[PDB]
């Protein structure tokens, strides 16, 4: 048992043992990017891969070739923190080595010279954080992994709804990784067609003609031959004994001197058995059956040299006579069977307007590029570039794999572009399914959906970056002089860095990290989307792809998906899921060999899994690990049934592996309706972090995994003991085993302190260890926000009781006791960033001076002499944060203003008042001021005080490092010097700096002291440079936008408590809007007097079948019972014996669990610290499907000395009388979501108006009025509200003149309206009148 | 049918609200059509009493 | 099958050379078919009666999606039961007439023990399965 | 020229340096759909705001709880007016500074301008004219809007965090318009079907039901009291049980004359609850209307008859009293819900083993190709489909009546007083449909196909579900949400077409 587990241990119900612990949840993000940016000395996906494809680039046959050597990644210009404050993207410079070779003219190749240009720079490429995010402009962003149709070929339907005939249709689609789509589709007439992209449909055979296949070769390929001999006179026929199945006799069919079947009897198993056993090879026939048959090849007249019949032409009873007299013994025909092998391609040829190769190559060119004439060079080049150019086409490896797979080939890798064979084999297979042999795919199956993620998608954006620079490089290499241009003159920087900046900056897949919550971050980074580039569109598909598919089991979560306009279009990654080498979705399983269940695990992709028969999660195995029952519920090929003991090939890994990280955090989930469960794990991520990190009384076990794997916490790199603990930093003196040989020293973890998050919430780390405590590798060193002691605590549990409280929980509304707001426990800390910009306008420069026209000293009190607000000043609405003035000269004031200025002697300023002031209603504490100044504009007074303080602070921090690092390093020197010369007292009198001289007798210890010497002088020198760059970065001109001189960013820390309007919900999809805040005096209490914190409405539970919220409340009730029990015994100071005796009883409970526990833990110093941590309640774990059962919950109620009902009688705090009936009370973990009221509440009387349409518009954040759309007008029309409507869309909005006539009237106290015409309509009149239309207003 | 019935409206302004606007004006502008208001939609458009 | 248990009938004791149509056997199978038809008719009536109480009592907006979901399943189901009754009735005409017991596609005879299992069987095991295969192929 | 007028009836001339095509004059009128300005939305509107909505049962039906902060900014020109009318401000510029200073003097002024001045409340999809209603505003410390609970039914508002908008009727006309047409009390009947739309919703109906209900034997059985006035006195002091069979003297009225009130006094056989309740019902109604059990259905028919006999005014104030009281007794009752409320039949596992062998029967016939394959699917699907109707009407007999209790003599059983039952029978929340998924097993689900799956959910919510059972429950849930997502779009288009032709 570990170190931060010994502190507080979650009682775990649930029987199935955990065999594989949840892996790093951020695997995907970190893994994928690492592959992209990394040296791979071969083609495997990466930056290397993209290069080797396009390179070598070669000039226009000029034998001037530019080849690709290798590439490097420069060090980050700013690190994570630095880059964030300033607003740069966190990027590294890409330096790539290029070699320019020139071939003599004319050359059996080899070079006159080659200049080996060192690393040209092509932009900076962003870098990923330690936790899988990017920084794009000082703002953390996430790149959502994508789901798109796997490359390969897929045969599809379009059954039913097509044409209102039924019939169905069948289509094939060849979807390559890069290059044009190739679609093959039928139609009602059973004609085969092809279309490139979604373009014009064309008769399928046209491409065969383009591959130099004529009519004869087209027939030979897709059809068999029926050979007709003219032997003696009039017609014999070669018979295949199988061909006659599914048809009826056409005449008297006889052979071998015996009539097997007569006219009119369908040829069945009887007739074919006779022919096959009697060996009937050749039969004589009548001349009329060939009246319909189609001739295969070309047959010409040997005498006249004329064409008798062209290939694919139907014969007649007279045409045969014409080629019989010409001496033709053979006539080859097509095998046509409308049950087995249908005459499809034949009819297409009769619909094909082309005949030769250039005919089709033109018809292809004119389809792609209509309007312009076809050419020989045009048609040939276009088609060769479509599916046969290494440059313009690639299936990738995945494409080649699924392609060959679906066609039942052997090779798993081959060509990267399509061949004449590939296309034919595909055309063949499409026909086969229509014939009844073979089945179609479905898009939804996770073997035909592939997952790409940042590493791959960036590759494509670099690839597109190169293809548009390649044209440019080829162009310069055309005219280029001798030894003057070098491989840098041609390659520009902006084109490469822009094509990648485009992506991370604005993209459907690049978004602001959902960071209000350690769960929110981790649930975002594990997210899928079928939208955007290469995927489906919301307006396209279409319920089949949105709906949950059988293949999601153990790969994609079935329940965590958004609840909006794109349901099922997102999904979230399952716990144990991982991405296949080829990019499919695989899941872990357990190898069941014969009748024993092993623990050796196998990863099975979506295609791999179907074949096997997989057992179930909940399966009882005992002793060696045989299945206990002779029959076990299992699922095999897409379905589920009972199976024999030794038929199961694998078994589920965990009871959990089907859900997501979000879904797994709900306790007693099994008992919750699927609808409400979705809402539960949907709202869990919206949990704003609380003031005091609680801990869930009712847990599942996953909470520790989510806390650690999300970055918010500080996890010990190396095990050791704590030397120094600060709210700022934590220093760990490493143990000897893990400590590296040289440099010795200590690991020092600097904590993140109060700072703005993406959602204006606060992200603050706190130390969770004490001075000199033992920690092991991978221990929790400091809690993030809404995490405690290593567990994920998204909220605070409280005493909750289900009962009507005079209607103050009418719908799902929540009723909260004052005890909560007094305890400041749902109080929530927010950090807003407000910025002031000194710009440059045409009239002049803006000054940040504190000289502000027409303001009293009352303002400039909270402002320093320079004009910036002091740190620490608690301000409210209206207070000025940064005084600012803009040049606005010669106001041109009116008569009465001049006299007023003259009466009171105000110096009507030549500068406008533009200062940044605090938005009305929001109020908080200033906790930080930043100043960013143009390079070359003078730093004002306060700006220099700041940049002076940052300097003094940075030196103290860095020097603290060296001071701690020296003593840490010197402490090892002291101990190795003791090994062969130990003079304990003699050594430490003299100056420690005067130690380096002391040597050692012949031994490796002399070579070890040599090691510590090296790493000493580097700390000495590495200090200097770290101080230099740090110092330059502060003073260096901070770069801003054009037109902007200097910027002041103030960071506010507003502390918002909790009030009616805030949305809150438990984890079970029970929303509710807090309605009244009651006195503890008025709360329902029990005979012990203890009030209850929240009074929820019982009606919300039966309707919405979220029954887990009840189980949670009861288990929570029992969990607090153990707490109150220990709290009494802990206050009694009973002694270790009585305490340990009671706790031990709790952790077993009934029998059969997985928990295990003491007495190993040191029966004193360790045991005592634990008891404290439990008195608030005993943390229990209900795994997802391995959860606790009613008996175990009720059993823990007995141990807590609490009623088994989970209900008690209560007394109304107002009347003091009893409540009839027992009511349920218990503890339910509850979240406060950030739909906080004082963010939603807006109001506007008269504000700014939009320029184009004089219409209320949010401009100064006094937001626009409510929009009064079409439907709200029908409302007034249904009433008689004729005037209410007029005023609504006249004076209240659009009537530029009416609004002021009204406002003036309002204060004069005359409620009237002088309406006139809405400007919205006046512009239509002008807009109409500026077209050719004479639109007037008639009459009077 | 309801959808077709609405397509015929005496007031051309009402039609350019929910029908295809380009077609309505052209068809109406060549005809020299006079709109007398009378209906609801249009009086709301032009902002006088329903 | 609990079908034989509900009634006081015991598995039929087919004798060695036992025929197929005597007074006692058709009187025996007529009763079973009539009793079977009468039970389904009572089931269809009970279904319709339950559905109307839901149609008469109005649920609250929140439980409407759950009531609507459950109302649709019964309706679909109800229509399925009505088809089955027509199928048994069709089978009752085959007993009375003289064209019961053989595959409709090929003249092959359908098994005796097989017909006691599914008296509504129209095809032999060979022909029926191929039809399901074409089905999955002609449809999807 | 052509790209200027309507670009798109050519090749689509693109804008400078920007790939996107440039928007022409015709495209400045056209849109999605038609004229943007008249299309939702729809023009933004001065004097307005919004926030999250909450409850407030203390309201009279003609009022609503409006945040102090909002009302100040909203009526700003009105306050500026009344302030200098009474002489509290030298000039408007001072008035601006006064309300900016939030001087306490202004609150007393605001209360003047607020009194007889209605505001308009509007909630998300405005579906019928009852989607906007006019209330009289009451000042609130807090940032949420307080919404009288009875209108929550009409709005299809729940409290899952929904927000509503406010609108100030400015002109004198708009005030008199909002008061005589859009006011709460003027619209209590739905214009679609004459029945009350201000029907008691859920919490409030659960109240009266528990109240006007009787159990076999409890304190107060059979005694007699002078009238309802002294019937209440008996309960509040713990001498009588709310539900005990009791004769009391009542006086009902009946206007059976020519619009004239006739009085009748009688010794009715009732319970204490129904006794207490009659003190609300105004004059001319018969005591018969409150003598029954009062479920959601009967509770609204009662309100209705009050309208069609006494008129608007008495019904309004009546309806208020119902709400105040319904909420109150629900609280006294201490009604709740725990795990032990969802009583599973003792016979459940029995029912299973029968249908489990029946499926084992239809399997036996399938085995090595006896009977065809597709038959077996639909054979089994039938033997499952029956058992759910068996389990349902099994638990429903146990859940319904099994409170077995005795009156002085031997034994007796009556409608259960179990918590979860009372809710559905009354109509407060949940339906026999939903109960069937809490206690009995929850039906069969169907795969994405629509083709119902041959192994139903054999577990219920009081039990756990296992891996597969939840995974099967998934499809119906997602398609369920998906569907109702579309049922929003379909309604919207249907109603839109209908008003265009009307
Ligand atoms: Mg809502
Ligand atoms: Zn057959």
């Amino acid at each position: 048992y570990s170190y931060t587990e010994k502190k507080r241990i979650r009682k775990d119900f649930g029987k199935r043992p955990q065999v594989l612990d949840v892996p790093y949840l951020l695997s995907i993000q970190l893994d994928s990017f690492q592959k992209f940016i990394e040296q791979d000395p071969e083609g495997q996906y990466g930056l290397e891969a993209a290069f080797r494809s396009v390179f070598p680039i070669q000039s226009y046959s000029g034998n001037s070739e530019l080849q690709y050597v290798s590439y490097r990644l420069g060090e980050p210009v700013f690190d994570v923190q630095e880059c964030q404050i300033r607003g740069v993207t966190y990027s590294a410079p890409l330096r790539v080595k290029l070699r320019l070779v020139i071939y003599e003219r004319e050359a059996p190749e080899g070079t006159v010279k080659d200049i080996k240009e060192q690393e040209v720079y092509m932009g900076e490429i962003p870098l990923m954080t330690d936790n899988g995010t990017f920084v794009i402009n000082g703002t953390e962003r996430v790149i959502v992994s994508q789901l798109h149709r796997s490359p390969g070929v897929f045969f599809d339907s379009d059954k039913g709804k097509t044409h209102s005939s039924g019939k169905v249709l069948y289509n094939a689609r060849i979807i390559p990784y890069r290059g044009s789509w190739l679609d093959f589709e039928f139609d009602p007439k059973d004609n085969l067609f092809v279309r490139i992209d979604r373009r014009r449909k064309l008769p399928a055979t046209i491409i065969l003609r383009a591959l130099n296949y004529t009519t004869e070769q087209i027939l030979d390929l897709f059809f068999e031959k029926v050979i007709f001999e003219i032997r003696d006179n009039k017609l014999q026929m070669e018979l295949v004994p199988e061909r006659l199945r599914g048809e009826t006799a056409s005449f008297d069919i006889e052979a071998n001197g015996k009539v097997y079947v007569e006219k009119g009897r369908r040829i069945t198993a009887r007739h074919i058995r006779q022919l096959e056993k009697d060996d009937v090879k050749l039969i004589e026939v009548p001349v009329e059956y060939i009246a319909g048959k189609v001739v295969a090849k070309d047959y010409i007249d040997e005498s006249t040299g004329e064409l008798i019949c062209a290939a694919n032409m139907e014969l007649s009873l007279d045409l045969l006579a014409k080629l019989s007299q010409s001496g033709h013994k053979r006539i080859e025909t097509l095998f046509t069977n409308d049950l087995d092998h249908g005459p499809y391609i034949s009819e297409t040829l009769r619909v094909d307007p082309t005949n030769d190769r250039l005919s089709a190559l033109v018809e292809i060119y004119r389809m792609m590029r209509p309007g312009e004439p076809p050419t020989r060079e045009a048609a040939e080049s276009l088609f060769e570039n479509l599916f046969f150019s290494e440059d313009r086409y690639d299936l990738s490896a995945v494409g080649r794999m699924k392609f060959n797979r679906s066609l039942l080939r052997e090779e798993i890798e081959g060509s990267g572009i399509l061949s004449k064979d590939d296309i034919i084999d595909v055309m063949k297979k499409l026909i086969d399914i229509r014939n009844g042999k073979g089945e179609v795919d479905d898009i939804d199956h996770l073997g035909n959906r592939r997952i790409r993620s940042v590493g791959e998608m960036a590759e494509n954006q670099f690839r597109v970056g190169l293809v548009r620079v390649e044209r440019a490089v080829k162009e310069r290499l055309s005219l280029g002089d001798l030894d003057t241009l070098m491989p840098q003159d041609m390659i520009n920087a902006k084109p490469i860095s822009a094509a990648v900046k485009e992506f991370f900056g604005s993209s459907q897949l690049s978004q602001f990290m959902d960071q209000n919550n350690p769960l929110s971050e981790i649930t975002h980074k594990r997210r899928i989307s079928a939208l955007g580039p290469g995927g489906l569109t919301r307006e396209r598909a279409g319920f089949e792809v949105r709906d949950v598919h059988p293949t999601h089991y153990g790969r994609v979560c079935p329940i965590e998906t958004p609840e909006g306009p794109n349901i099922g279009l997102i999904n979230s990654l399952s716990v144990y899921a991982q991405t296949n080498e080829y990019g499919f979705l695989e899941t872990p399983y357990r190898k069941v060999t014969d009748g024993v269940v092993t623990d050796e695990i196998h990863y099975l992709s979506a295609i791999e899994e179907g074949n096997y028969v997989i057992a179930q999660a909940n399966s009882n195995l005992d002793e060696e690990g045989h299945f206990v029952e002779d029959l076990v519920t299992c699922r095999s090929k897409g379905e589920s049934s009972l199976f024999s003991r030794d038929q199961v090939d694998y078994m589920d890994v965990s009871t959990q592996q089907v859900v997501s990280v979000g879904a797994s955090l709900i306790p007693f989930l099994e008992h919750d309706d699927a609808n409400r469960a979705l809402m539960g794990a949907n709202m869990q991520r919206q949990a704003v972090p609380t003031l005091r990190a609680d801990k869930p009384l009712v847990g599942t076990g996953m909470e520790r995994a989510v806390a650690v794997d999300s970055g918010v916490t500080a996890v010990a790199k190396r095990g050791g003991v704590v030397q120094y603990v600060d709210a700022s930093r934590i220093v760990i003196k490493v143990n000897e085993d893990e400590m590296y040989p040289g440099e010795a020293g200590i690991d020092i973890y600097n904590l993140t302190k109060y700072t703005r998050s993406n959602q204006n919430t606060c992200i603050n780390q706190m130390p969770c260890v004490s001075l000199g405590e033992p920690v092991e590798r991978g221990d929790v060193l400091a809690d993030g926000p809404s995490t405690d002691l290593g567990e994920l605590a998204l909220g605070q549990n409280m005493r909750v009781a289900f009962m009507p409280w005079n209607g103050y929980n009418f719908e799902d509304s929540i009723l909260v006791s004052e005890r909560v707001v007094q305890e400041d426990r749902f109080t929530t800390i927010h950090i807003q960033e407000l910025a002031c910009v000194s710009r440059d306008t045409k009239l002049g420069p803006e000054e940040i001076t504190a000289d502000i026209p027409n303001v009293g000293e009352a303002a400039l009190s909270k402002l320093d002499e320079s004009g910036i607000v002091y740190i620490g000043a608690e301000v409210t609405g209206g207070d000025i944060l940064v005084g600012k003035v803009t040049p606005k000269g010669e106001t041109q004031l009116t008569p009465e203003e001049k006299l007023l200025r003259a009466i009171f002697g105000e110096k009507a300023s030549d500068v406008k008042d533009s200062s940044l002031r605090v938005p009305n209603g929001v109020s908080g504490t200033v906790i930080d001021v930043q100043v960013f100044t143009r390079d070359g504009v003078e730093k004002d007074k306060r700006a220099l005080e700041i940049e002076e303080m940052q300097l003094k602070q940075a030196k103290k921090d860095l020097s603290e490092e060296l001071q701690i690092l020296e003593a840490g390093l010197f402490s090892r020197i002291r101990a190795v010097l003791v090994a062969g010369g130990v003079e304990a007292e003699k050594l430490d009198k003299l100056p420690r700096d005067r130690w380096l001289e002391l040597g050692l007798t012949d031994e490796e210890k002399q070579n070890q002291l040599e090691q510590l010497a090296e790493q000493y002088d580097e700390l000495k020198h590495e200090f200097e440079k770290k101080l230099e760059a740090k110092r330059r970065k502060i003073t260096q001109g901070d770069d801003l936008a054009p037109g902007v001189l200097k910027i002041v960013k103030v960071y506010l820390a507003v502390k918002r408590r909790i009030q009616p309007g805030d949305k809150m919900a438990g984890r079970h999809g029970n929303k509710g809007v807090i309605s009244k805040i009651n006195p503890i005096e008025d709360m329902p209490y029990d005979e012990n007097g203890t009030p209850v914190d929240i009074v929820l409405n019982p009606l919300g539970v039966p309707s919405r079948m979220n029954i887990g919220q009840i189980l949670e409340t009861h288990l929570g009730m029992a969990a607090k019972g153990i707490g109150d029990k220990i709290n009494a015994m802990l206050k009694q100071q009973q002694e270790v014996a009585k305490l340990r005796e009671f706790i031990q009883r709790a952790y077993d409970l009934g029998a059969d669990v997985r928990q295990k526990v003491d007495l190993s833990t040191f029966s004193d110093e360790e045991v005592m610290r634990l008891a404290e941590n439990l008195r608030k309640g005993m943390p229990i774990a209900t795994p997802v499907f391995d959860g606790a059962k009613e008996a175990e919950i009720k059993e823990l109620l007995k141990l807590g000395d609490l009623p088994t009902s989970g209900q008690i009688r209560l007394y109304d705090g107002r009347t003091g009388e009893q409540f009839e009936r027992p009511v349920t009370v218990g503890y339910m973990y509850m979240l406060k979501l950030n739909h906080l009221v004082d963010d939603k509440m807006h109001a506007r009387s008269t504000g700014s108006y939009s320029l184009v349409t004089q219409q209320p518009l949010g401009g100064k954040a006094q937001f626009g009025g409510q929009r009064f759309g079409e439907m709200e007008v029908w409302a007034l029309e249904a009433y008689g509200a004729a005037y209410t409507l007029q005023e609504m869309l006249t004076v209240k909005s659009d009537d530029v003149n009416g609004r002021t006539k009204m406002y003036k009237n309002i204060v004069d106290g005359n409620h009237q309206m002088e309406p006139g015409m809405p400007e919205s309509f006046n512009v239509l009149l002008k807009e109409i009148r500026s077209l050719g239309i004479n639109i007037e207003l008639e009459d009077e | 049918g309801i959808t077709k019935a609405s397509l015929a409206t005496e007031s051309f302004i009402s039609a350019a609200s929910f029908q295809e606007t380009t077609r309505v004006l052209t068809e109406a502008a060549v005809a020299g059509k006079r709109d007398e208001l009378r209906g609801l939609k249009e009086n709301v458009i032009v902002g006088r009493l329903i | 099958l609990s079908i034989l248990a509900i009634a006081g009938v015991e598995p039929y004791q087919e004798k060695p050379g036992e025929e197929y149509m005597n007074e006692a056997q058709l009187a025996h199978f007529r009763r079973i078919l009539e009793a079977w038809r009468n039970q389904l008719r009572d089931e269809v009536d009970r279904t319709v009666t339950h559905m109307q109480d839901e149609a008469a009592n109005f649920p609250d907006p929140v439980d409407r999606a759950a009531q609507e979901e459950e109302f649709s399943l019964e309706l679909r189901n109800r229509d399925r039961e009505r088809k089955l009754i027509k199928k048994i009735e069709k089978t009752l005409k085959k007993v009375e007439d003289e064209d019961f017991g053989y595959c409709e596609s090929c003249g092959v005879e359908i098994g005796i023990r097989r017909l006691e299992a599914r008296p509504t069987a129209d095809l032999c095991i060979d022909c029926k399965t191929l039809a399901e295969i074409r089905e999955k192929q002609m449809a999807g | 020229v052509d790209a200027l007028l309507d670009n798109g009836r050519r090749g689509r001339a693109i804008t400078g340096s920007n790939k996107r095509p440039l928007k022409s004059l015709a495209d400045m009128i056209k849109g999605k759909q038609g004229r943007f300005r008249q299309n939702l939305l729809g023009k933004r509107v001065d004097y307005s705001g919004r926030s999250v909505i909450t409850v407030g049962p203390y309201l009279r039906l003609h009022q609503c709880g409006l945040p102090k902060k909002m009302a100040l900014e909203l009526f700003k020109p009105f306050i500026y007016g009344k302030l200098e009318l009474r002489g509290l401000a030298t000039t408007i510029k001072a008035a601006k500074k006064m309300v900016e200073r939030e001087e306490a003097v202004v609150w007393d002024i605001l209360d003047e301008v607020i009194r007889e001045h209605p505001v308009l409340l509007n909630r998300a999809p405005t579906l019928h004219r009852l989607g906007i209603q006019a209330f009289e505003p009451v000042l609130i410390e807090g940032k949420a809007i307080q919404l009288h609970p009875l209108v929550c039914a009409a709005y299809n508002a729940d409290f899952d965090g929904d927000q509503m908008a406010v609108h100030v009727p400015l002109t004198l006309e708009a005030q008199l318009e909002a008061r005589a047409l859009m006011m709460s009390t003027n619209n209590i009947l739905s214009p679609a079907n004459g029945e009350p739309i201000i029907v008691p919703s859920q919490d409030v109906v659960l109240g009266l039901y528990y109240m006007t209900r009787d159990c076999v034997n409890a304190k107060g059985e059979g005694m007699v009291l002078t009238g309802p006035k002294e019937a209440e006195r008996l309960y509040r002091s713990g001498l009588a049980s709310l539900h005990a069979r009791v004769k009391v003297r009542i006086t009902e009225y009946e206007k059976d004359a020519n619009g004239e009130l006739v009085a009748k006094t009688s010794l009715k056989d009732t319970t204490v609850g129904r006794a207490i309740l009659w003190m609300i019902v105004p004059k001319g109604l018969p005591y018969s209307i409150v003598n029954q059990a009062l479920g959601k259905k009967a509770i609204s028919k009662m309100l209705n008859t009050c309208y069609r006999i006494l008129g608007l005014k008495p019904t309004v104030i009546f309806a208020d009293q119902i709400m105040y009281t319904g909420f109150a007794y629900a609280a006294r009752s201490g009604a709740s819900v725990g795990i032990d409320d969802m009583v599973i039949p003792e016979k459940k596992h029995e029912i299973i083993s029968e249908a489990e062998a029946e499926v084992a029967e239809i399997q036996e016939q399938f085995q090595s190709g006896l009977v065809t394959a597709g038959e077996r699917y639909n054979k089994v699907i039938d033997i499952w489909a029956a058992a759910n109707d068996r389990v349902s009407k099994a638990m429903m007999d146990n859940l319904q009546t099994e409170t077995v209790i005795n009156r002085d003599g031997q034994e007796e059983k009556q409608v259960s007083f179990n918590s979860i039952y009372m809710m559905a029978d009354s109509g407060a929340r949940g339906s026999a449909a939903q109960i069937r998924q809490l206690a009995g097993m929850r039906g069969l689900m169907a795969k994405p196909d629509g083709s119902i799956i041959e192994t139903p959910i054999t577990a219920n919510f009081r039990e756990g579900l296992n891996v597969l059972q939840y995974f099967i429950s998934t499809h119906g849930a997602r398609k369920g949400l998906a569907d109702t997502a579309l049922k929003t779009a379909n309604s919207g288009y249907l109603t839109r077409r209908l008003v265009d032709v009307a």
Side-chain angles (χ1 to χ4, degrees), chain C residues 103 105-106 108 123-124 127:
Chain C
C103 174
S105 178
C106 59
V108 183
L123 304 170
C124 66
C127 287

Side-chain angles (χ1 to χ4, degrees), chain A residues 805-852:
Chain A
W805 207 95
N806 272 89
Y808 276 6
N809 54 355
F810 173 63
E811 285 284 319
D812 304 58
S813 42
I814 288 185
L815 190 269
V816 176
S817 88
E818 204 174 24
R819 184 74 80 220
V820 186
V821 49
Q822 292 179 350
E823 281 192 279
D824 267 312
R825 55 182 321 196
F826 267 179
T827 293
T828 202
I829 282 176
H830 307 153
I831 297 186
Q832 310 187 19
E833 165 181 330
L834 300 74
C836 182
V837 279
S838 163
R839 290 215 176 83
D840 218 338
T841 73
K842 34 176 158 288
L843 319 163
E846 310 178 341
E847 306 177 32
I848 313 296
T849 195
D851 189 36
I852 305 182

Side-chain angles (χ1 to χ4, degrees), chain D residues 10 57 74 86 104 181 214 236 306 333 391 409 414 422 454:
Chain D
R10 301 301 211 189
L74 272 137
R86 304 183 101 76
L181 315 177
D214 68 322
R236 298 295 285 119
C306 182
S333 73
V391 186
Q414 71 190 168
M422 279 185 289
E454 53 174 287

